[PDB]
Amino acid sequence: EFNILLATDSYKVTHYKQYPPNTSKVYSYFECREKYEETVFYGLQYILNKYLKGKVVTKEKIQEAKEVYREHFQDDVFNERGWNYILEKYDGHLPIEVKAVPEGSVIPRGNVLFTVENTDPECYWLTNWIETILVQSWYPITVATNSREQKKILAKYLLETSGNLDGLEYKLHDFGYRGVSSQETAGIGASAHLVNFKGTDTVAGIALIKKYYGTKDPVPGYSVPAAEHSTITAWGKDHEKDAFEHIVTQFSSVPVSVVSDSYDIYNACEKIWGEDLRHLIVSRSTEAPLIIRPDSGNPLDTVLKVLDILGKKFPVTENSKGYKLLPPYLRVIQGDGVDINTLQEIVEGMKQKKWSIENVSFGSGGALLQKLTRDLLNCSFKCSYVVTNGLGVNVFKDPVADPNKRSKKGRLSLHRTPAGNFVTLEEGKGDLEEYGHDLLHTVFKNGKVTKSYSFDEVRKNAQLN
Amino acid sequence: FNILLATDSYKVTHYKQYPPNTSKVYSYFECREKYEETVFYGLQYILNKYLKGKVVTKEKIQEAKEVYREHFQDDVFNERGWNYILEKYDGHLPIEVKAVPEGSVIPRGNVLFTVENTDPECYWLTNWIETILVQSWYPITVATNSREQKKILAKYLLETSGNLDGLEYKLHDFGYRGVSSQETAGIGASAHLVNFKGTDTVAGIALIKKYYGTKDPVPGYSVPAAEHSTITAWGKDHEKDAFEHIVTQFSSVPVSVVSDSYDIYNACEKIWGEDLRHLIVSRSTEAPLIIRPDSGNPLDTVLKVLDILGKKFPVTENSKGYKLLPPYLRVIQGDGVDINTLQEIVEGMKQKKWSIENVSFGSGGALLQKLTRDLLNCSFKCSYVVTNGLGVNVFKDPVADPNKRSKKGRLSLHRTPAGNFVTLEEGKGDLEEYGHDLLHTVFKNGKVTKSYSFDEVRKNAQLN
Ligand SMILES: NC(=O)c1ccc[n+]([C@@H]2O[C@H](COP(=O)(O)O)[C@@H](O)[C@H]2O)c1
Ligand SMILES: NC(=O)c1ccc[n+]([C@@H]2O[C@H](COP(=O)(O)O)[C@@H](O)[C@H]2O)c1
């Protein structure tokens, strides 16, 4: 089982002896320090429920921690007393209060997103002990944010080239399951992407959403049948056509994606799909199109040549915006080399060549769920206020060599400005009541989740515009 | 955990795409052709935690059936196939996995492990588990990147001190908060511990002892250390009090004290260097003060810090001619360190004549998070199938990218006469023109057939 006493950075075990004597309170906060100008706050609710709520302290876990740390530090520095107190006083429930903005909220950089403080003067050391666990929320936040920023690009070009945003939620598919660092990461990352889109091949995200957020529909994400290199190459190089025919025939009534670059993407599109099996394609339903899938070469150049080829072998129409459109039974999915940067290049390149963004959907894996760091949005957790000797003290850091690492001072609160923007008031100035109500809500207190959100609410909060 | 729900969605639809009359699907994993050799580590963890024993149950099958029915809006799930495995093998997977020993250091472009079904009815199972097995790229990459950094550290420590004492402690893992999840933290931390012994991510410890085991009393260690909150809590005008309180609380053990809260240079020169100097020069070699800068240009900061300390404390020159701080005073750079800057820092220290003995490093996100599967081009591909009872050598070869070509047929790994490695394709390993295949069966029909202790892994991964 998971032991919260063992889920922190090793040195935090020695911190209770480092605070000023008679410190009864430690107050800390998380922010995405000051392009990603606005961030999607999502993921905390998962961590609270899975790791922090309920009886997380037991006699066993304490003993286990005692032994582990004794060897790790080659000494007994573990705060056994402190934990026994929580076990005995609160029945293993954590005496801390957490306030946060609603899950899914879109908040500009440099603002307080959530705060942590102890509710018992005895557990002044508990606030920062759980920094490590709570800080990992940077990941679902960063994934959701990066995913949302790509949706903006897609939304912009789709609107421009088609006149509407139909199907936008299916324009960027999650292909990152094998590309992430672990199973737990796959679930968290995939759920973050689902906040903005509906297409995913990382099934793990579904279960996480159901269990920790919940949705009205029986499922938050969908997928379609699709081939991979093994199912095509297995037929032997001279039988790629046989493979294609067999696959589109097995999935004749549902959308089907078929990777076509095993040997020569251009020959596959022009001769096999465009000639040898054209009759099996033009006969398909608009609800069950063939989705050709290139998977190599320069992303933009490949997509353009593919479209040029298909346009020469299939009927092409021009929509009301003046952009070329493949027939309804035929589409393309670019699932290689796609990241927020190249995505922009591809749709822009398509527009210049007069191809509607309607013709192509995208897939992204590692770049979507793995090539992300806590530094992209500068997620940071810092102590800004303590009470020692019964007196409040506003604390902060301000490294001389880096003004960007400066932190906020005192008790904080988030407010809406008259012009509809946001501001984080420091030093308790929020009490002045000049900016309406603080936007953070208590979501956790003394072992209980006091406020939560359904995934439908999160999605609503994260919408664009 | 349900293995029937631990694969890329589309693989659920593959059993109907393979050529009819296919009785076998054989696939392999490689770190396709800096980073010329990789450390094979991690597969054993995945086999034990996710693939061994009864992994199929009536419940798990029904659960997947319903999930996929809604996910696909159609019942494409292969309930019959999974049910077959449940009744025939009591939920044990009919697959065989062969691999090089855990910890092996292998050149790029070589087969590292292979997978194949052992029951003709389960030809589709081989690639069903590709997703879960492919995630081994992570520990492989962490271990590899960490080992390359140890090489750099080794080169400069030896060059500037004459030996390699304490090498396994020169790079500390600070990545707990910087990774994407709890599970990732444990996996990555254990990968790092293959090369070093210092870590702040305790989860790595539990993973090691449970999945590999060690006859070791100290697989991973750590020392008392302050953070910004414990220093800044005292108030800006009391940083000195915080420092004095901390060093006295940990008077007899090594202690790391972050010193850049306000002005790292003032702390080194005035506080540690003057006001509290009496509390430092009195410490023992086994309980040094470890000053930790945490901001600014990593190389420039370290050099200015050493220059400052050199002026306030007695400096010696070792037998190699490099300057050395007193035994009770050291430095740890735990910000902005990665494989590239690490190299710039030690080279910069060497030019200014400072022994690498003076400084140790810490790395978080760059160590366990800023890494991807394409760093070593980790890939899983099918190279052989049996259809209509005839073997067929399989492979891909995209016209737009020769780097994506895969190997053909049955593979085997052998040592060459000159002591190198070669991957023999198309079953040629059978000719016996080389020695024994270096891959070993580590998994077969639900059972882990060969295991390695973390001590063997460390041995296999050693340097030089
Ligand atoms: N349904 C699908 O076509 C599907 C699902 C998961 C991964 N993939 C492929 O796997 C690879 C993963 O690599 P990346 O992490 O770079 O995306 C890509 O080539 C991707 O297209 C495809
Ligand atoms: N014992 C320690 O000093 C210790 C442990 C864990 C993290 N840290 C700090 O946490 C931060 C982690 O951030 P990065 O992911 O960018 O490495 C660093 O500033 C690092 O120094 C320090």
Swiss-Prot record, chain A:
- Report the pathway entry: Cofactor biosynthesis; NAD(+) biosynthesis; nicotinamide D-ribonucleotide from 5-phospho-alpha-D-ribose 1-diphosphate and nicotinamide: step 1/1
Q: Where in the cell is it found?
A: Nucleus; Cytoplasm; Secreted
Listed A to Z, the keywords are: Acetylation, Biological rhythms, Cytokine, Cytoplasm, Glycosyltransferase, Nucleus, Phosphoprotein, Pyridine nucleotide biosynthesis, Secreted, Transferase
Q: Where does the record place the modification Phosphoserine?
A: S454
Q: According to its UniProt record, in which tissues is this protein expressed?
A: Ubiquitously expressed in lymphoid and non-lymphoid tissues.
> Which residues are listed as membrane-spanning?
none
Q: Which GO terms describe its cellular component?
A: cell junction; cytoplasm; cytosol; extracellular space; mitochondrial matrix; nuclear speck
InterPro entries hit by this protein: Aldolase_TIM, DUF5598, N/Namide_PRibTrfase, Nicotinamide_PRibTrfase, Nicotinate_pribotase-like_C
Modification sites for Phosphotyrosine? Y170
- Reactions listed under catalytic activity: beta-nicotinamide D-ribonucleotide + diphosphate = 5-phospho-alpha-D-ribose 1-diphosphate + nicotinamide + H(+)
E.C. designation(s): 2.4.2.12
Kindly give the Gene3D superfamilies that the UniProt entry links to this protein: Aldolase class I
Reported induction: Expression shows a diurnal pattern of oscillation across the 24-hour light-dark cycle in liver, with a reduction in levels before the onset of the dark period (at protein level). Expression shows a diurnal pattern of oscillation in white adipose tissue (WAT), peaking at the beginning of the dark period. Up-regulated during polyclonal immune responses.
Positions contributing to beta-nicotinamide D-ribonucleotide binding? D201, R293, P294, D295, G335, D336, G366, R374
EC class, as a word, reads transferase
GO BP terms: namely: circadian regulation of gene expression; circadian rhythm; inflammatory response; NAD biosynthetic process; NAD biosynthetic process via the salvage pathway; NADP biosynthetic process; nicotinamide metabolic process; positive regulation of canonical NF-kappaB signal transduction
Binding-site residues, diphosphate: R178, H229, R293
Q: Which family is this protein grouped under? A: Belongs to the NAPRTase family.
Partners and quaternary state?
Answer: Homodimer.
- What does this protein do, in the record's words? The secreted form behaves both as a cytokine with immunomodulating properties and an adipokine with anti-diabetic properties, it has no enzymatic activity, partly because of lack of activation by ATP, which has a low level in extracellular space and plasma. Catalyzes the condensation of nicotinamide with 5-phosphoribosyl-1-pyrophosphate to yield nicotinamide mononucleotide, an intermediate in the biosynthesis of NAD. It is the rate limiting component in the mammalian NAD biosynthesis pathway. Plays a role in the modulation of circadian clock function.
Question: Which NCBIfam families does the annotation name?
Answer: PRK09198.1 (NF006629)
Record's protein name = Nicotinamide phosphoribosyltransferase
> Which organism's genome codes for this protein?
Mus musculus (Mouse)
